Structures are given as structure tokens and as C-alpha cells.
């Protein structure tokens, strides 16, 4: 009775949205991005290799000063690195050995940490007492942490493993707003440069744009075919690229609500773990699954380079806010800085 | 103003020395332990036996058998979509797989078989190995003796199956329950030797609900796992 007519209304709505997508697709950028000459071969060498972690390194993040970085590994240790002089500033021990996310606050005072313990532990880097002391502890969800980012010092947004995303206040330690629209568990969420929207990608082969004010969805991008693993905004804030385990990386656009350009090769056989861009947004980097990582040109789908320096996975990869370094994480407990 | 940044890097080097000293202190602590994952099915009974012998997302147990310390991690408050959080547990020495070997979801045994299949054929668990437990074989004996819920009507291979030569004797053993229990073993080893080649192996052992030697049995299994990994690195096997 109700279920079949609801399903046929959903099908009619989906057909209408597909027609609306097809109406505004007057052209593709494959015939418009060929005019600018390609960047050619791009080769970069391991400048510094930060050694000292034991287990697999799952996530890293840079700082606002583009000088300090945080690495979280599965041995239960979080290390603040000094990327200029290969130095270790702090080595924070963790309550849970398994972590898959770490964050650096924009004010440089806090480091967030989370993992399979269903707890986002946030530490304090300032003040004159001995060592590093955990300030708050957020536990209000029923699934494993996947990735967490900082809005500012006052709030933090977390992507969870129970098909939910949550916005957490710091002082009260409560969920201000929750984002429940996904059907599979969410891994990667990336914040817009204006700190007002974010897009979260899950294992339902789709990514959803949100707001942090009203707490509802905006777009429902469906253009993939497997579990989306990583996501990262353009520096301009009107496009974003996702990379799934289907060995393809796809770039979407916020304004036309269509997938713009995909990158694929026949020899590419392994999925995507991490995706980050450059300062100009021209050169996007995809941490791959076949024991190395790659460079894409993001206007025309051409492989402009390759970086191969790992004996294992490329679990995470980040690029500084200034753009003078490319950082990579790996399962062979080694961080490398490329320039 | 050279002295200011000079003693700044001096203090930075001192902090580096202290942090590296602490890291080297904890490196032996990390490498001196062995990590085990418990997976499901009677897991509560065997972990209670572990606690007698010795909603958070991860539960903590500690062993101290024979002056070797073991990590055992049992998962909870997590969804059944276990495809992407199990990639963390690849550096563990062994994944303990407890299977309720009496419930034959309409069939629990087939679900156990493809959970084993997905663990075996995954592209990140090839290095790690599995210790298999056929828990709840006491009710298996009563179900075999009843004969109203026979494995024959849910398995066509049981009609033509023959008993292996390696029979384990224990007084008052029904031949039919031994035949069924070793067929249940063989169903798991078909998957185990379908693709397992040198890198990892299965260790199929049978425990009741009142057994107590599971600690020493997991001890021996980790011993053989470390020995086989070392022997494969020596090109000796």
C-alpha cells in the first residue's frame, strides 16, 4: 500500500533529478582543459624521512604554520614532529592503541586523537605544567572513529562509523548537531576553507555536502561504484575530489552537481587511500594502494608523476597550507617529506 | 641575537634526546608483547575462562603466561560491517576465530565458513594467521545423539564423507559425533589449503565449554606462528 507508492515516488524523483542533471550538461571539461599546456613530468625526491614510529602510521595532519606535523600510529603513540629539523617535540602516549585519525587545531594549542575506542581524545599543548595532559574526552556515538577535523578551538567535527557525522563542542563536551543521512559508515570528511560546509564520503558510494549551521544535507553526489575512502576540497571551495577502492579518482563540482572528470588507467588495479591537493589546486595527489602513490593533473586526466618510496601502504597524505612540502604516511612506520 | 636561537635549538635537541630515550624505552615494551584479535558464538565463556586463568569499543585483557605478556583485543559496540576496521588487525600474530559448531540466519556454520573465507582471502590478512576454535561441541554431541536436527539434511557431503585416520580417543565417544566433528574440521581446512601457501596457516583445535588448556594451546600456537614466520624468512620451509 504505502511502501510501493513511496518507492514509485522515489523513483519518479530520481528520474527527475537525473533529467535535471542531464539538462545542464551542455559540455564536459575534457574539451575545454586541453588549451592550457600540461605540466609535464613532475619528479620530487624524499627530502626528509622522519623515523621513530613502530607500528603502522594511519593518519597525519599539518599545522597552520606549515612547520609542525602530528603523526598517529597504531603503537599507541602520537608524535609531534618538527619538519624543518627532523625533531620530535612531544611524544604523547594514548589510552587506546588503535587510532586512525589525528588533528591539529588551527590555533596550535590542541591535538585531537581518535580511533576504535569510540572516543575522541583531545589533548592540550599549551600551559606550564609537566608533559601533555588530556583536556576533554568525547564519547557520544556507537561506532568507530574514522576522521576528525577542527573548526576552531571551540568545536570539532567527527566522522563516525555508525553512518553518522557529529559536531562536538569543547567545554560542555556534547553533540551540538548530528548529521544522519548516510547508509554506510563514513570515513573521510574535509572542511571547506571558509569553515562553514564540509562533505563526508562513506561506503555507500556517495558523498554528501552538509552545513555546520542548519545541520541538513545539500547535495547527494552519486557517481562512484565502490566504497569512497578519502576526500579533500579544492582550495577555492567549489569542488572536491574523492577516491574509492574502485581504483578510480573522481572530481565533483558543487555548483552543477555533476561529476566533472575521472582519472583512470588500465594498469591501475589498486584502490585509493588518501587524496590531497596543492596550493593552486592544479596538482592533486592520490595516495594509492599498490605500495606507492601518484600525481594527477586535475584539468586533463594525465599522470604527471609518481612517488615511490614505501615498502608498504600509503595510508595517509597531506600538503601544507603554504605548499612547500608534501607529507606521506605509510604502514612501514616511516614518514617522508617530498619537495 | 645568535644566543637566543642557539639555545632554542639546544633545548630542542635536549627535548629530542628525552623523547627518543622514552621511545626506546617503550619500543622493547611494544616488541616484547604479542597481539591477538578475538573474533566470533561462546566468546563470553572462553574469555571468562581466560579471566579465571589470569559500552567501550575495545575491551582490554592481559595475559602473563610463562613470563610472556599477551595482548588480546575483543571488539564490541561495532556494526557487523567489519570490512574496513579489520584492516587494522594485520600486524597481530594470530586472529582467534571462535565458531559455534552446533548451530547448523538459518545456518550459522555457513556464516562462519565465509567469515573464515573473507579473513583468508583478504589482501591484508595474508601475513596474519588464524587460530580456530570449535566451541560448543558438548551440545553437538547431544544434537548428534538426538538425530532430529541432523547435519545430513543441511549438508550433502556428509553422506559420502569418511573418517580420517587421525582419530582422537576419549572414553564414551560416539563414532557419529567424531565423524561430524572432523567433517566440520575438513570444511574449514578446504578453505585453508585452497589459497594458504607458506605465508599463513590455520590451527584447528577443539575445545568444550569447560576446557582450561586453551591458554597453553594459544601459547603453543603463537610459538609455532613465530617459528614458521622466522623459518619462511630463513628460506628453510
Amino acid at each position, epitope marked *: 500500500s504505502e511502501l510501493d507508492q513511496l518507492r514509485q515516488e522515489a523513483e519518479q524523483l530520481k528520474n527527475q533529478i537525473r533529467d535535471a542533471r542531464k539538462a545542464c550538461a551542455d559540455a564536459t571539461l575534457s574539451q575545454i582543459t586541453n588549451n592550457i599546456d600540461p605540466v609535464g613530468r613532475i619528479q620530487m625526491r624524499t627530502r626528509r624521512t622522519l623515523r621513530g614510529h613502530l607500528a603502522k602510521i594511519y593518519a597525519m595532519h599539518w599545522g597552520t604554520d606549515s612547520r609542525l606535523l602530528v603523526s598517529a600510529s597504531q603503537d599507541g603513540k602520537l608524535i609531534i614532529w618538527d619538519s624543518y629539523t627532523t625533531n620530535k617535540v612531544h611524544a604523547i602516549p594514548l589510552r587506546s592503541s588503535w587510532v586512525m585519525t589525528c588533528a591539529y587545531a588551527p590555533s596550535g594549542n590542541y591535538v585531537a586523537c581518535g580511533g576504535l575506542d569510540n572516543i575522541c581524545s583531545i589533548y592540550n599543548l599549551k600551559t606550564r605544567e609537566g608533559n601533555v595532559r588530556v583536556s576533554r574526552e568525547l564519547a557520544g556515538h556507537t561506532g568507530y572513529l574514522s576522521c576528525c577535523r577542527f573548526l576552531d578551538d571551540n568545536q570539532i567535527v567527527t566522522s563516525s562509523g555508525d553512518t553518522t557525522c557529529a559536531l562536538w563542542d569543547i567545554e560542555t563536551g556534547q553533540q551540538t548537531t548530528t548529521f544522519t543521512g548516510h547508509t554506510g559508515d563514513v570515513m573521510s570528511l574535509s572542511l571547506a576553507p571558509d569553515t562553514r560546509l564540509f562533505v563526508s564520503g562513506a561506503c555507500d558510494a556517495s558523498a554528501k555536502l552538509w552545513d555546520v549551521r542548519e545541520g541538513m544535507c545539500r547535495q547527494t553526489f552519486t557517481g562512484h561504484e565502490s566504497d569512497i575512502n578519502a576526500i579533500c576540497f579544492f582550495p577555492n571551495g567549489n569542488a572536491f575530489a574523492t577516491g574509492s577502492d574502485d581504483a578510480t579518482c573522481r572530481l565533483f563540482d558543487l555548483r552543477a552537481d555533476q561529476e566533472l572528470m575521472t582519472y583512470s588507467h588500465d594498469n591501475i588495479i589498486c584502490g585509493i587511500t588518501s587524496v590531497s591537493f596543492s596550493k593552486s589546486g592544479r596538482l592533486l595527489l592520490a595516495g594509492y594502494d599498490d605500495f606507492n602513490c601518484n600525481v594527477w593533473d586535475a584539468l586533463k586526466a594525465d599522470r604527471a608523476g609518481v612517488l615511490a618510496g614505501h615498502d608498504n601502504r600509503v595510508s595517509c597524505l597531506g600538503v601544507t597550507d603554504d605548499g612547500m612540502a608534501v607529507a606521506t604516511g605509510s604502514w612501514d612506520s616511516f614518514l617522508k617529506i617530498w619537495n | 641575537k645568535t644566543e637566543d636561537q642557539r639555545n632554542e635549538e639546544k633545548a630542542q635537541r635536549e627535548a629530542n634526546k628525552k623523547i627518543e630515550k622514552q621511545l626506546q624505552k617503550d619500543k622493547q615494551v611494544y616488541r616484547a608483547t604479542h597481539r591477538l584479535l578475538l573474533l566470533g558464538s561462546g566468546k563470553n565463556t572462553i574469555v571468562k575462562q581466560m579471566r579465571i586463568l589470569h559500552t567501550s569499543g575495545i575491551f582490554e585483557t592481559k595475559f602473563q603466561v610463562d613470563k610472556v605478556n599477551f595482548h588480546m583485543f575483543d571488539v564490541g559496540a561495532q556494526r557487523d560491517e567489519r570490512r574496513k576496521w579489520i584492516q587494522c588487525f594485520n600486524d597481530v600474530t594470530a586472529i582467534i576465530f571462535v565458531v559455534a559448531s552446533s548451530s547448523y540466519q538459518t545456518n550459522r556454520l555457513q556464516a562462519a565458513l565465509k567469515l573464515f573465507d573473507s579473513i*583468508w582471502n583478504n589482501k591484508w590478512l595474508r601475513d596474519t594467521s588464524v587460530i580456530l576454535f570449535l566451541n560448543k561441541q558438548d551440545l553437538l554431541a547431544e544434537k548428534v545423539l538426538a538425530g532430529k536436527s541432523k547435519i545430513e539434511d543441511y549438508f550433502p557431503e556428509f553422506a559420502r564423507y569418511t573418517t580420517p585416520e587421525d582419530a582422537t580417543p576419549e572414553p564414551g565417544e560416539d563414532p557419529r559425533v567424531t565423524r561430524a566433528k572432523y567433517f566440520i574440521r575438513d570444511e574449514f581446512l578446504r578453505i585453508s589449503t585452497a589459497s594458504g601457501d607458506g605465508r599463513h596457516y590455520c590451527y584447528p583445535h577443539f575445545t568444550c565449554a569447560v576446557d582450561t588448556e586453551n591458554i597453553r594451546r594459544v601459547f603453543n600456537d603463537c610459538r609455532d606462528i613465530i617459528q614458521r614466520m622466522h623459518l619462511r624468512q630463513y628460506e628453510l620451509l
Partner: nanobody
Amino acid sequence: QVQLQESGGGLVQPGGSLRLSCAASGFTFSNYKMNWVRQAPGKGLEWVSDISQSGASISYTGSVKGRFTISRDNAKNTLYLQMNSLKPEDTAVYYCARCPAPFTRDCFDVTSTTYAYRGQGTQVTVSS
């Protein structure tokens, strides 16, 4: 978009024949081995049969083999079941489940209570 729309299904007599046909669109078909999962009225999800990427390795459960045969035509983007010697205890809603990863032998969370790459489901009822 990724979707799986399947057809067939109806009230048939025991021991009859019924071609449970399933169709797909979007994703490529040469990779992505696909299984069959059924859920009985009053029971959880259970697996029936699976096929490989090329179509060489076919396996079935205990209550299905020798009676039901599955097949895949990757040119026509169609994979279907074949019901023969149909038992009264096989009534269920059948889902055209799909493995989440390209060309990996392992297949995870096919029988999960919530899933993304799974069909809506067609109901087959068998009775006298």
C-alpha cells in the same frame, strides 16, 4: 548511480521451475563477483550461491547444490537464478548482492543487516 533491479517471483507449486532474473546498471560487470542472499519470513539473512568474476568458479550452500544453478552473462549485464526441485522451505525475499571491491577473492558483509550495494528484493512464495 549504482542500483540493482531484479525481476521474477510469484506463487508457484513445490518442485516447479522459476527463473529468478536480476539486472544491474552503472558499475562495470567483468569484475565485482556477485552472490545471492535470501531472508526468510521470520529469519535472518542467509547466503545461497556465488559466482566468480569470469564465471569459472561457482559454489553453493548445502540446501541448494544439485537443485539450483546460477549463471552470469556479463555481455548482457544480467545474472540470474534457476529454480529446480523447489522445496517448500525456500520461500524468501531474494537480493542481488554485490561484492564491494574490484577483483578481490574475499567478499565482506554480504549478509549484513544493512548494506549499500544490494537490490531491493523480489519475493518468492512456495506453498501447496
